[PDB]
Ligand SMILES: OC[C@H]1O[C@@H](O[C@H]2[C@H](O)[C@@H](O)[C@@H](O)O[C@@H]2CO)[C@H](O)[C@@H](O)[C@H]1O
C-alpha cells in the first residue's frame with residue numbers, strides 16, 4: 001500500500017535530501033522508500049527495512065530485474081518507535097542516515113541522476129513528516 | 138507547468154503543515170499551491186500569488202466552478218527573493234504564514250477535510266524545499 005508519493009519533474013538528484021519521520025505499526029512487516037526514474041518508473045534506489053528479519057535490504061530495479069542486494073549489517077530501527085531516515089544524494093552515492101547516524105552508502109546504478117523525479121513510500125510506516133530539500137553538493 | 142506534487146492517501150488535513158521554500162524567476166508571472174480533494178481532484182484550497190499585480194488570490198474550485206475570490210490586502214513577497222510559505226490546517230481554516238508572519242486565514246469550503254490527499258505546486262516558483270508534517274490540532 002502506497003503511503004506517500006512525491007514528484008519533482010525537474011529532477012531531485014543529485015544534491016537533494018529526503019527526510020522521512022515516522023514509526024512502524026508492527027514488528028512483523030516492512031516498509032520501503034523508493035526513488036524512481038523517468039521514463040519507465042524504474043527503481044533507481046530501493047531502501048527496504050524488513051522488521052521480521054531485522055535486515056535493511058537495498059537494491060535497484062532496472063531493465064525489468066532486481067540487481068544484487070546490498071544488505072546492511074546493523075538494523076538501527078525499533079518497531080513502533082519513532083525514527084528519522086535521511087537519504088542524501090551526491091554524484092556517486094545515496095547516503096543513508098538513521099536517527100542522525102550514517103548507516104550506509106549505495107553507489108548509483110542508474111547513472112542518469114536527473115531522471116530521478118519520484119519518491120514512493122510503501123507499506124508499514126506511519127508517516128509523521130516528509131521533507132524534500134535541495135542541499136547542494 | 139507542474140513543479141511539485143505530493144500524495145498522502147490517508148488524508149493530509151486537518152492538522153498538517155506544508156512548508157514551501159523557494160523564489161520566483163520573474164516579477165511578471167505567478168505561482169500556485171493547490172490542495173486537492175479526492176475523488177474528483179477538486180481544488181479545496183488554491184493559493185495564488187500573482188506578481189504582475191502584486192495580489193494573493195485564494196479560492197476553491199468545487200463542483201466545476203471557481204467560488205468567490207478572497208484577495209489579501211498585502212503582498213509580502215519580493216520577486217527573485219527567497220521566501221517561506223507555511224500552510225497549516227485546523228478544523229476551521231487554512232492558516233497561511235509567509236516568512237514566519239501570519240498573513241491570512243481561509244475558511245474551509247470543502248468540509249470533507251480527510252479527502253484532501255494531494256498537493257500541487259505550479260508555475261513560476263523555483264523550489265528549494267517542501268516539508269509536509271503532521272502537527273496536531
Ligand atoms: O532485492 C530487493 C527485492 O527483494 C525481493 O525479495 C527477494 C528476497 O530479498 C531474496 O532473499 C530472495 O528470496 O528473492 C526475493 C525475490 O526477488 C522483494 O520481493 C522485492 O520487493 C525487493 O525488496
Ligand SMILES: OC[C@H]1O[C@@H](O[C@H]2[C@H](O)[C@@H](O)[C@@H](O)O[C@@H]2CO)[C@H](O)[C@@H](O)[C@H]1O
Pocket residue numbers: 183185194195196203206
Ligand atoms: O479565482 C481564482 C482563479 O482566478 C482565475 O482568474 C479570474 C480572475 O482572478 C478574475 O479577476 C476574473 O478575471 O476572472 C478570472 C477567470 O475566472 C484564474 O484563471 C484561475 O487560474 C484562478 O486563479
